[PDB]
Amino acid sequence: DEVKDYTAENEKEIVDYLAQNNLTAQRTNSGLYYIITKEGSHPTLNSNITVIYKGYFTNGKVFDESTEGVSYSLRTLIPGWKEGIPLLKSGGEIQLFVPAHLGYGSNGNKTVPGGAVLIFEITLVSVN
Amino acid sequence: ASSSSTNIFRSFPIPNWSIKYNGLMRYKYFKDKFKRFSLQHNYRASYTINQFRSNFDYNSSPKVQDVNTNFYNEIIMSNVNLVEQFSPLIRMDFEL
């Protein structure tokens, strides 16, 4: 029908962003790039977390934010969060570079277009 | 289902029909005692969403799945109705 592949374009855009800004990011097998700025003293799939994240586009425009702690079940979130959050502990800080297939997909939603790369700055304050 | 529409709403209505046929009065029914004869058929079908609404859970937050692990839907409704009526399916009205 209208099946659109964005994996190569998303990877190229993420690499170009990590080149323009002097950032070194680890890459998972699913195509997600993450930078662990700090850690704590590990949330699982069946775990509630509190976050102070901020999510924007490659141009810096913020599409989502929570300046106050918000609680999530970590099973209801996008796959990028599902594989990025368990990589640190309470008090840790991460920067995710989620591609579309791990974000909001090829169709997207309102205020997030299809095939878009999302950058998340997530602070994990609690793992309970 | 491989090519049918996955949209909630429809743009083009499909026509419903009413058919009347007084066409047997002139073949041989003059001498078959028939002083009247007609056939009638009717079909009317509708697809109705009594109440749809936008979903607040369909937002920009990272939370995308509900308690049933289903993706949130932008437009949510409680019921869908498919009503079909043959009124009549067939009506034969004649007089000898």
Added chain:
Amino acid sequence: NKYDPATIGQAGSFLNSNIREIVTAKSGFNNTNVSEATDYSVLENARK
């Protein structure tokens, strides 16, 4: 409060998954002094 249906039986909820079933509704509470008609009520085919 801890009766949040979104947090049923996560870490410190007052409800278990048994709260979802009519047969095990009473056992779905993590507290002790819960009554079948004071703290909660149950219907099997409730009409909207």
Added chain:
Amino acid sequence: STVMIKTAFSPSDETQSAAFDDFRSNRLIIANRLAEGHYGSGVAIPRY
């Protein structure tokens, strides 16, 4: 206004319904199409 005369004369009772069997079978087809729409063929579609 719509037309569904194609299933009008299929038998449908408490023991059999061809249209309801089609309803049951169409769920996986529709879910797969929606998954292709969401995961756009660049990755294997995750399943349960």
